[PDB]
RNA sequence: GCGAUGAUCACCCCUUCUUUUUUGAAGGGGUGGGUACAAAUGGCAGUCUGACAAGU
C-alpha cells in the first residue's frame, strides 16, 4: 500500500514514477511507437524522458481508455473485481488520510478513550482490591486498618505470605518504620486463622494482579499526557492533563469543545447543578469541571471564582489554537503566555485586601 | 410472455382492485386531510420561514433595474 | 410563584392533591366524632 | 410549596 | 486493523494474534506459517489476515499506541490464565470441603449454592422448600420437569449436611445419593 | 409522533431499495447497512425477522435532497441495489450513507468531495460502510482521481456552484456507462440569484442537452426546499 | 414572578421539542414537476397513467406511486390530528415564551446605566 | 417388586342425492411476562449573566 501510495500520488500531481520509467523502458526496444496517455500533463512529463516514443494525449482516446477501464476485471485475468474495489478501497483512505494531513500522533478519539480506560481501570483495581484485603483478611484481618492502600496492602501478601514470616520479613521498602512495626506486633496477637500453601498460592496471585494492575494504570496514565501534549499542548500548560482530557471527553471531540464558548466551559462538569438552580431561581454554579485546575486551587475565597471565569476564557483561546489550527507548532507556545496572564491576574486580585488597612 | 387471456386479464384486473383497496385503509379519508393539511402549511411557514427571501428576490431585482 | 410543568410531574401534583384532601376529610370527620361523644 | 405554586401553558 | 476484528471472533484468540500480528504491513510466509500454527488453518484465516492486511483499511496507529495495545493485550491473557488456575483451585476445595454435595450436583454448581446461602452452615440448617427457592433465580437444580428439581433440592438438602457437620467429609454417601 | 417505544409495519416503496414505515405517520425509511449506530443522529427502526434483528435508519427530507425528491414523486431514480454511484459534492454522511443503503453490500458509492473539514467525517463514516469509497478532491478536474473510479450506472451531483454544469460534463464523459444515469440537485441562488429560479433551471436544461445528457423529468423541492430542484437525465453518447 | 434565566430554559427546551416533534411528522409534496418530450406528437399523446404505468388513483398520490405492475380508523387518523396539533402548541408556546423574554430583556436593559436620552450617542469607557 | 431419608397438589393460532325401503352414500408456532450482562450520537436533557472594576 505504501508504495500504492507513493505511485499513485505520482500520477496525481503528474510526475513520472521511477516504477513507471522501469516499466515503459522495458519497451524501448520498439522504435518509432506511438504512446497513449489518458492525461496531458503525464504525456508531457513522459516527453522530457527522452523516451522514443510519440506520446498522444487527445481527446479521442478517451473512448479508449472508456472500453479499457469498463471491461478491465476481464481485461487483467487473475483478479475479480471484489479484489479491485477492496484494492480501490485502500488506496482511497490511504490517499484520503495523506491530503488531509493526517498524523497518527494527532488523533483526539484515543484521549476520550484513554481516559474512560482509566476510570474502568480504577474501579476494577478498586474491586479486586477489597477482595484481597477480605480474603487475606481472614488469615490476618487487621492489615485493612493499618495499611489503606491497596498497592501496599497487596505487596505485603507478596513478601510475607503467612504471619509466621512476619518476625523475620522486612517491610521497610513497602512500608515507613512505625507503619512495618505495628504490622509485626499484630502479626502474633494477630485473630486469623492458618492458610494452605494452596490457599496461599492463589492469593499471591491475586495479589500479583493487584501490583500489575496498579503499574499498568502508572503507564497509562502517563500515556494520557503523552497523548495530551501532542494532540492539544496550549491546554496541558493551562489546564493540565487531566482536567484537559476530561474537558474534551464530556464534549465527545476537540472541535465540540473548541466551538463551545467560554462560559459553557467555565461550568462543563455541573449540568445537575445548573439546571437545577436555573430552573429554582436559585445561585448557579461557577466552576464545573475546572474546579480541579491548578490555578483556581491556588486562588482563595471569591478570588476562586473569577479566576475560574479568567481561566475559562483564556482555556478557549488555547483550546481552539490547538483545534483549528493548520500548521500548530507543538510548543504549546500560545497557552504558555496566556497563564502569564491569568498568573498576572491572580497576582493582582490575590495582592488585593479587602479589609481596610 | 404476452400471452394473457381474457380470463388472465381479469384476475390480475382484481388483484390491482385488491392490492389497490387495502392500500386506501392507510391512504387514510379525505376530511381529516382537510384539518391536517391546514395545519401542516401552518407549521412549515414558521419553520421554513422565507418570507425575507421572497422579500430579498423582490429588492435585488428593483435595485437592478435602470430608474426614470 | 409560576412555573409550567412536564406530564409526570402534574400526575404526581394532583394526587398529592388527592391526598391531602381525603386526609383532611379523614381527618376533618373523627373530631366531631369524638367531640360529640 | 406546591400550593404556592401556579401552573400555565397547560399542556 | 477493522478487518481481523471480524475474521476471528473469539476475543481469547483475538489477543494472541494481535500479540504476533502488531503491525498488518508485516507480511512474510514464515509469519503466515506463525500464525497458521496459532489455532488451525481449517478456519483458513490465516490465508485471510495475509490478504486483508495487505489490503485493508484501519490506520496505522503510533509505535506508542501499538505498545498499549499488545501490553493490554497481554494483560487480557494473563487474567484468563489465573481465571483457569483458580477454576480448578475451587474444584479442588469444593470437593474437599463438600464432597457429597460436589459429586450430587456440581463443584461450580455447589459453590454457587453455598454462595447463595451465604455459608454451608446456613444452607444446612435451611428446610428442602427453602433450599429449592434458593437457586431458583439462576435455575441451579434444573410439571415433570419441576418434580425433579423438587426431588433433586431435597437430595442436596441432605447433601449439603453431611459435608457441614463431618469433620472429615467423605463421597460415599453423595455417590449413592 | 413516531416514538421510540411505537410500533411500525414497513412496506416497500416503488423504488426498489427503499422502503415506507406505514403507522400513524408514513417515514421514508432505507435498510441500516452498519446496525447498531446512526450516522448523524437519524432515528433507527428494528424489526425481528426469522430471529435475525434487520435495522433500518429513517430518512429525513429537509436533511437530504434526494429524500426530497422521492416524497416529490420522481419518476426514475437509477440509484438501485447492484449499481455503481458516483456522488460529487459529498459534504458528509448524511446522504451518502442513505444512498450507500440503496445500492447494497455488491453495490458501491463514490463519494466526491474537496473542502477538508468535512472530508475527515466522510472518511470515518466510510470506515463503517465498506462499499463507500471515500474519494477527496476537486471535482473541477476528475483526471486528478481517475486511479480509484471505474464506471458508473449513474451520476448523483449536490454540488452547490456557478459552474457546476462543467463538473457533470467532464464526471460523465470520463466514468459515466452509455445511457447511464444523470441527476442534479440544482440551487438557483447559487447560478445566479438575480434572475427568477424558473429562468436558471431552464439554462442548466440547455447545458445538459449540449453535453450530449438527455433530460428526462424535472422536480423542484418546495416544500421541504425553496429555489431547487432535481433534474433526471439519461447520457446519450451516441 | 419569574426571573429570565428561567424563562430563556424553558423555551431551549420547546425549541427543540419542536424540532424533534416536526421531524417525526410527515408531509405532502408542494414541489412542481415537469416532463422533457420529444415531439410534439409524443407531447399530444402523453398521458400520466402510461408515463408511470399507474392508476388515476396512484397519478393523484405523487408520494407512493406505485406502479400498475407493482399492484399487480376514525379514532386512528383522529390521533394523527392531534400530533400535528401538539407541535402546533409547541410553537405557539414557544413564540409566547419568545414574547415574555423581550419584554425581561427590556425592562433589564432600560434598568441598564446608560444616558438613556431613547439613547444617547455616547462610547462607554 | 413405592412414600415423613417426603406421596400428592399467562394469552392466541344439518345440506344434497338415493331406496322394494323406516334405505344407503357425499359434504407445532406466535404473543406476554421474570432474572442477569452488554450497547445506543435513544429519553428525561435545556449548557450561567455580560460592562464596568480598582486607585488618588
Not at chain 6, 216 to 234: A, F, K, N, S
Request: charged share 30%; with cysteine; glycine share 6%.
Amino acid at each position: 500500500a505504501a508504495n500504492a501510495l507513493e505511485e499513485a500520488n505520482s500520477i496525481i500531481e503528474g510526475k513520472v514514477s521511477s516504477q513507471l520509467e522501469k516499466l515503459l523502458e522495458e519497451i524501448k526496444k520498439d522504435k518509432k511507437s506511438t504512446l497513449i496517455v489518458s492525461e496531458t500533463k503525464l504525456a508531457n512529463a513522459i516527453n522530457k524522458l527522452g523516451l522514443n516514443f510519440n506520446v498522444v494525449s487527445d481527446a479521442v482516446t478517451l473512448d479508449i481508455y472508456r472500453a479499457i477501464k469498463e471491461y478491465l476485471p476481464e481485461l487483467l485475468p487473475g483478479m475479480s473485481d471484489n479484489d479491485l474495489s477492496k484494492m480501490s478501497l485502500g488506496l482511497a483512505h490511504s490517499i484520503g488520510r495523506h491530503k488531509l494531513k493526517f498524523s497518527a500522533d494527532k488523533v483526539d478519539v484515543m484521549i476520550i478513550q484513554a481516559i474512560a480506560l482509566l476510570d474502568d481501570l480504577d474501579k476494577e483495581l478498586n474491586t479486586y482490591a477489597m477482595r484481597c484485603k477480605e480474603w487475606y483478611g481472614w488469615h490476618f484481618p487487621e492489615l485493612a486498618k493499618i495499611v489503606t492502600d491497596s498497592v501496599a496492602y497487596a505487596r505485603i501478601i507478596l513478601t510475607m505470605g503467612i504471619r509466621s514470616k512476619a518476625s523475620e520479613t522486612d517491610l521497610s521498602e513497602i512500608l515507613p518504620e512505625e507503619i512495618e512495626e505495628r504490622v509485626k506486633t499484630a502479626a502474633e496477637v494477630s485473630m486469623g486463622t492458618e492458610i494452605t500453601q494452596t490457599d496461599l498460592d492463589n492469593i499471591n496471585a491475586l495479589a500479583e494482579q493487584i501490583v500489575e494492575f496498579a503499574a499498568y494504570r502508572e503507564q497509562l496514565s502517563n500515556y494520557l499526557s503523552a497523548r495530551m501534549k501532542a494532540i492539544a499542548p496550549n491546554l496541558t500548560q493551562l489546564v493540565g492533563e487531566l482536567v484537559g482530557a476530561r474537558l474534551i471527553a464530556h464534549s465527545g471531540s476537540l472541535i465540540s469543545l473548541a466551538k463551545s464558548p467560554a462560559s459553557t466551559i467555565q461550568i462543563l462538569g455541573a449540568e445537575k447543578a445548573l439546571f437545577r438552580a436555573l430552573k429554582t431561581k436559585h445561585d448557579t454554579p461557577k466552576y464545573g469541571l475546572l474546579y480541579h485546575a491548578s490555578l483556581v486551587g491556588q486562588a482563595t475565597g471569591k478570588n476562586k471564582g473569577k479566576i475560574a471565569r479568567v481561566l475559562a476564557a483564556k482555556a478557549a483561546v488555547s483550546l481552539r489554537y490547538d483545534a483549528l489550527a493548520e500548521d500548530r507548532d507543538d510548543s504549546g507556545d500560545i497557552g504558555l503566555e496566556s497563564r502569564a496572564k491569568v498568573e498576572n491576574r491572580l497576582s493582582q486580585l490575590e495582592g488585593r485586601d479587602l479589609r481596610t488597612t | 410472455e404476452g400471452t394473457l387471456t381474457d380470463h388472465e386479464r381479469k384476475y390480475l384486473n382484481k388483484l390491482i382492485k385488491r392490492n389497490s383497496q387495502n392500500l386506501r385503509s392507510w391512504d387514510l379519508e379525505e376530511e381529516v386531510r382537510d384539518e391536517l393539511e391546514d395545519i401542516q402549511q401552518s407549521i412549515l411557514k414558521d419553520t421554513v420561514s422565507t418570507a425575507n427571501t421572497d422579500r430579498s428576490k423582490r429588492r435585488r431585482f428593483k435595485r437592478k433595474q435602470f430608474k426614470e | 410563584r409560576a412555573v409550567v410543568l412536564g406530564g409526570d410531574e402534574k400526575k404526581a401534583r394532583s394526587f398529592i392533591q388527592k391526598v391531602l384532601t381525603i386526609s383532611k376529610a379523614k381527618d376533618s370527620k373523627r373530631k366531631e366524632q369524638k367531640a360529640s361523644q | 410549596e406546591d400550593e404556592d405554586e401556579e401552573e400555565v401553558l397547560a399542556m | 486493523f477493522p478487518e481481523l476484528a471480524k475474521l476471528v471472533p473469539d476475543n481469547y484468540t483475538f489477543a494472541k494474534l494481535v500479540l504476533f500480528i502488531k503491525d498488518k504491513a508485516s507480511l512474510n510466509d514464515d509469519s503466515l506459517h506463525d500464525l497458521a500454527a496459532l489455532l488451525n488453518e481449517d478456519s483458513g484465516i490465516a490465508q485471510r489476515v495475509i490478504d486483508n492486511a495487505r489490503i485493508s483499511m484501519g490506520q496505522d496507529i503510533s509505535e506508542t499506541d501499538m505498545e498499549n495495545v499488545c501490553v493490554f493485550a497481554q494483560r487480557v491473557a494473563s487474567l484468563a490464565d489465573y481465571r483457569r488456575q483458580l477454576y480448578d483451585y475451587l474444584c479442588e476445595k469444593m470437593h474437599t470441603v463438600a464432597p457429597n454435595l460436589s459429586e450430587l450436583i456440581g463443584e461450580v454448581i455447589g459453590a454457587r449454592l453455598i454462595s447463595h446461602a451465604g455459608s454451608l452452615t446456613n444452607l444446612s440448617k435451611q428446610a428442602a422448600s427453602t433450599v429449592q427457592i434458593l437457586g431458583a433465580e439462576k435455575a441451579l437444580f434444573r410439571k415433570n420437569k419441576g418434580r425433579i428439581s423438587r426431588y433433586l433440592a431435597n437430595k442436596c438438602s441432605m447433601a449439603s449436611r453431611i459435608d457441614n457437620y463431618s469433620e472429615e467429609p467423605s463421597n460415599v454417601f453423595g455417590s449413592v445419593l | 409522533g413516531a416514538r421510540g417505544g411505537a410500533k411500525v409495519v414497513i412496506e416497500p416503496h416503488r423504488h426498489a431499495g427503499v422502503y415506507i414505515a406505514r403507522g400513524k405517520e408514513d417515514l421514508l425509511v432505507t435498510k441500516n447497512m452498519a446496525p447498531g449506530e446512526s450516522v448523524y443522529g437519524e432515528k433507527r427502526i428494528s424489526v425481528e425477522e426469522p430471529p435475525t434483528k434487520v435495522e433500518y435508519r429513517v430518512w429525513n427530507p429537509f436533511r437530504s435532497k434526494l429524500a426530497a425528491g422521492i416524497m416529490g414523486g420522481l419518476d426514475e431514480l437509477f440509484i438501485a441495489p447492484g449499481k455503481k454511484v458516483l456522488y460529487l459534492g459529498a459534504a458528509s454522511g448524511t446522504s451518502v450513507s442513505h444512498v450507500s443503503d440503496v445500492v447494497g453490500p455488491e453495490g458501491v458509492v463514490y463519494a466526491v468531495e474537496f473542502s477538508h473539514r468535512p472530508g475527515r467525517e466522510l472518511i470515518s463514516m466510510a470506515k463503517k460502510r465498506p462499499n463507500i469509497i471515500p474519494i477527496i478532491e476537486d471535482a473541477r478536474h476528475p483526471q486528478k482521481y481517475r486511479m480509484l473510479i471505474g464506471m458508473v450506472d449513474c451520476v448523483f451531483a449536490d454540488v452547490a456552484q456557478p459552474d457546476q454544469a462543467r463538473i457533470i460534463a467532464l464526471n460523465s464523459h470520463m466514468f459515466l456507462k452509455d445511457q447511464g444515469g444523470v441527476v442534479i440537485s440544482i440551487k438557483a441562488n447559487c447560478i445566479d440569484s438575480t434572475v427568477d429560479a424558473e429562468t436558471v433551471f431552464a439554462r442548466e436544461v440547455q447545458k445538459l442537452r449540449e453535453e450530449r445528457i438527455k433530460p428526462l423529468e424535472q422536480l423542484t423541492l418546495e416544500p421541504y426546499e425553496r429555489d431547487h430542484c432535481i433534474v433526471v437525465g439519461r447520457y446519450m453518447r451516441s | 414572578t419569574q426571573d429570565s434565566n428561567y424563562v430563556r430554559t424553558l423555551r431551549q427546551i420547546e425549541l427543540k421539542k419542536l424540532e424533534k416533534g416536526a421531524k417525526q411528522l410527515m408531509f405532502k409534496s408542494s414541489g412542481n414537476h415537469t416532463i422533457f418530450v420529444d415531439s410534439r406528437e409524443k407531447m399530444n399523446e402523453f398521458t400520466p397513467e402510461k408515463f408511470f404505468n399507474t392508476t388515476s388513483e396512484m397519478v393523484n398520490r405523487s408520494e407512493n406511486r406505485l406502479t400498475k405492475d407493482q399492484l399487480a380508523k376514525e379514532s386512528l387518523d383522529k390521533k394523527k390530528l392531534k400530533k400535528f396539533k401538539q407541535v402546533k402548541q409547541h410553537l405557539q408556546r414557544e413564540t409566547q415564551l419568545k414574547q415574555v423574554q423581550q419584554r425581561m430583556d427590556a425592562q433589564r436593559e432600560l434598568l441598564k446605566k446608560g444616558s438613556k436620552k431613547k439613547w444617547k450617542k455616547q462610547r462607554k469607557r
